[PDB]
Amino acid sequence: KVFGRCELAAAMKRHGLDNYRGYSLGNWVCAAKFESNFNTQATNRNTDGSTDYGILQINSRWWCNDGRTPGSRNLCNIPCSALLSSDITASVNCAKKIVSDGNGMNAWVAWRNRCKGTDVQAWIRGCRL
């Protein structure tokens, strides 16, 4: 599913992301934009052989099991395929564990490089939340 901006804001807000560990909804929408372009089916192979999955490009190195990341944990206790669903519960519940791990949203390289310190509220402008 390729989500609309405001649709994904609504979904993330309903799944408790809004101000989750102090991160405003627009931070999350900004991260999803540059990670996946709002596409739940996005996958990207990392040089190390891990893969990033779904709207927030959650990495098989740590967070989900894809059966082909040697030496990897599944800290979210899910198959990585669950992170490509139209329904973002699995992605959102895993992102909560991630952002609580103590680097906050720095865990998302695209959030650190492209969203951090920017007017992120522009990502939720004109959305009925």
Smallest distance, Å, CB 111 to Cl ion? 11
Which residues fall in the annotated binding site? 101
Of residues 47 and 113, the one with the C-beta less far from Na ion? 47
Site string for Cl ion, 33-72 (x = CB under 5 A): ----------------------------------------
The DSSP secondary structure of 48-97, one letter per residue, reads: TS-EEETTTTEETTTS-B-S--TT---TT-SBGGGGGSSS-HHHHHHHHH
Site for Cl ion in 62-121 (CB under 5 A): 104
Q: Which of 7, 18, 35, 66 is catalytic?
A: 35
- Close Cβ partners of 129 (under 8 Å, ≥ 6 residues apart): 9, 10, 13, 18, 25
59: contact with Na ion by CB under 5 A:
no
- Cα dihedral 128, 124, 104, 11 sign: positive
Q: Which two tokens mark 24?
A: 């405003």
Residue 72 binding Na ion, by CB under 5 A? yes
Determine the size of the site formed for Cl ion (CB under 5 A): 1
**Binding-site residues for substrate, please?**
101
Q: In the complex, which residues of this chain contact Cl ion (CB under 5 A)?
A: 104
Name the residues annotated as catalytic: 35, 52
